[PDB]
């Protein structure tokens, strides 16, 4: 997270940290608890990940510290990539983890609501992006989960700053024309959460963007409301 501040325990209970174990155990991506066995993250997080057995999902974490060998985790039973996904820039950057265990909810870990297809007429004023990612380019993974409040821009304005990319209906952008605050390496797959009318909603998945917190180059996020049916297809299966 570029230009962000530290979160407090309990502030983003839906934020998970997704680790891989081979060759090393490292932090890979963000992700969001959306149900008691379901993590919603980005498709791109799994390039060259060809087995769920090497994934650890850690919930209730504030500090990337907190973990080592006897810390609890959730195993990933199944990786579900959107069938049309090729690359981040191309869209469909959405994936579900079906966990093996069931997540118990509490003050350090709760699900975040998805948007309602009949609420794309809400304009969200209060959006944050969270993550353990770089604070600048050429940094390393952060110990403490960072936060940064970011304004949505319209897809029309986003399209003008990404000439030569099709900014589809199923993407949404957020950044300061100033620059200065954004996601960066390590925050991808993380949530883009918007408080509105008492409740938090999962509005975007951190997917791609030109550099990090760059002037006139807002981050691009999977627009989660355009995939709710897709999510419900996979998570409510018979």
């Amino acid at each position: 997270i570029v230009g962000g501040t530290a979160s407090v325990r309990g502030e983003w209970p839906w934020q998970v940290t997704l680790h891989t174990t081979s060759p090393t155990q490292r932090h890979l991506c963000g992700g969001s608890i959306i149900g008691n066995q379901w993590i919603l993250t980005a498709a791109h997080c799994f390039y060259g990940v060809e087995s769920p057995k090497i994934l650890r999902v850690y919930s209730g974490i504030l500090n990337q510290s907190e973990i080592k060998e006897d810390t609890s985790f959730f195993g990933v039973q199944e990786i579900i990539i959107h069938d049309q996904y090729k690359m981040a820039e191309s869209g469909y950057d959405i994936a579900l983890l079906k966990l093996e265990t069931t997540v118990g909810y509490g003050d350090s870990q709760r699900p975040i609501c998805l948007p309602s297809k009949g609420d794309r007429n809400v304009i969200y004023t209060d959006c944050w992006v969270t993550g353990w990612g770089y604070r600048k380019l050429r940094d390393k993974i952060q110990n403490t989960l960072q936060k940064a409040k970011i304004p949505l821009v319209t897809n029309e304005e986003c399209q003008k700053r990404y000439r030569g990319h099709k900014i589809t209906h199923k993407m949404i952008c957020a950044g300061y024309r100033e620059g200065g605050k954004d996601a960066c390496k390590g925050d991808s797959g993380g949530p883009l959460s918007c408080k509105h009318n008492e409740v938090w909603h999962l509005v975007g998945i951190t997917s791609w963007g030109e550099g990090c917190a760059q002037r006139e180059r807002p981050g691009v996020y999977t627009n989660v409301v355009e995939y709710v049916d897709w999510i419900l297809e996979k998570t409510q299966a018979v």
């Binding site: 149900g35 419900l232 409510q236």
Partner: peptide, 8 residues
């Protein structure tokens, strides 16, 4: 408690 929800 969410209008869109994932049954456990």
């Amino acid at each position: 408690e969410c209008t869109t929800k994932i049954k456990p």
